[PDB]
Amino acid sequence: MSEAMASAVDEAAFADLVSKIQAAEASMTDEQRAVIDPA
Amino acid sequence: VRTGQPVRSLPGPFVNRVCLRVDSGYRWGESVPVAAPAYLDAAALRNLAEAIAPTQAAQYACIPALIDDRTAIHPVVTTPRLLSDTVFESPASAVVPQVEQTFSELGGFLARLHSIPLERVAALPTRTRPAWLQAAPQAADGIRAARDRLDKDAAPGIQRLAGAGAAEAPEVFPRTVVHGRLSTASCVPGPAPRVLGWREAGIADPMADLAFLLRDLVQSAAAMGAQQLQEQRARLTAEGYEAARGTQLSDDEHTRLAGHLASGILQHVALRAWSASDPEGADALLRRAERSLPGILGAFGAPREVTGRL
Ligand SMILES: [Br-]
Ligand SMILES: [Br-]
Ligand SMILES: [Cl-]
Ligand code: NA
């Protein structure tokens, strides 16, 4: 892969991870939040 | 900097990591580029969490849930800072005692992790090599080829420790739960430090976990020059591990530790040479690691049996 390709792959992989974490945070219910983040 | 947005991005050859600011703190996520059975699945992560839960290691273990086969989400932590931010700091800033104490706490944490009986972790695989190399056998062979092309005279002490020296230790010793990727970039610093990652965990040599942690001290000493600070961190790590375990490391344990550490340095420099087509830069890194390693192993408490090999 060229440098332009490698940068495109890295940008896409990073944004996909951010989107997945954002989606999980937005949609997790209080019961799921209770299991992952206990107090 | 706003809630719901990424505050840190840590790309890597084998894993991408992001820290999202959220309402309740800071949420780490990780992705790997291939779905591979080498990475712990949901059941293995649950089995390991269940085994850690009744122990003194529980407080530190921030074990993720899986969104999908490639993607992990961690329990929230209170800061986006990482121990690596201190270890690789350039230029120097003020020593924060509570951050430095993280090394003693990590050594104690690891001693506790390494005491979990194997019968409580039936889902964990034996780690015959790091999870990331087992997931990508072509990368492993390429790194091995680049490592073979390293100048054998650049770091003769590191070569001895990784090769002939490592083989002198007995092969029969207790294998333990290992975290598998305990770099300083996977540690949230104290007070109340937390350990991230976990999908590379399994059953292997406990000395490999300590070696992986010490590698960051060697690399930073070589690259940034704070040799004395890195040596003190190494000494604190050993102090915490030995105090928690109640027994000092044996000569055999030190031989295995030094072998994993020296091999890890060679893997690191070989990766730079092969990932970035930089044989000459990797050579420079290796020669500096050769100069930094003796003091770090000495501070950790390694005997002349190990440090005699240079
Ligand atoms: Br889990
Ligand atoms: Br490696
Ligand atoms: Cl290194
Ligand atoms: Na001996």
Side-chain angles (χ1 to χ4, degrees), chain B residues 215 218-219 265 268-269 289:
Chain B
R215 185 185 68 185
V218 178
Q219 177 192 344
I265 294 161
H268 185 78
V269 308

Side-chain angles (χ1 to χ4, degrees), chain A:
Chain A
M1 302 191 141
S2 58
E3 178 77 2
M5 179 69 72
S7 177
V9 171
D10 292 340
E11 292 188 15
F14 153 85
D16 281 341
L17 174 56
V18 170
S19 300
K20 288 184 179 176
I21 304 308
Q22 291 174 330
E25 173 77 19
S27 72
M28 90 158 69
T29 67
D30 294 356
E31 269 49 78
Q32 333 204 51
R33 186 169 309 260
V35 306
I36 188 185
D37 309 306

Side-chain angles (χ1 to χ4, degrees), chain B residues 102-114:
Chain B
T102 308
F103 284 95
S104 178
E105 309 171 294
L106 280 171
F109 165 76
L110 282 177
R112 291 298 181 252
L113 183 71
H114 296 163

Side-chain angles (χ1 to χ4, degrees), chain B residues 27-46:
Chain B
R27 175 88 72 191
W28 280 103
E30 321 191 351
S31 66
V32 293
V34 303
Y39 289 116
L40 295 191
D41 52 39
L45 288 164
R46 179 163 177 184

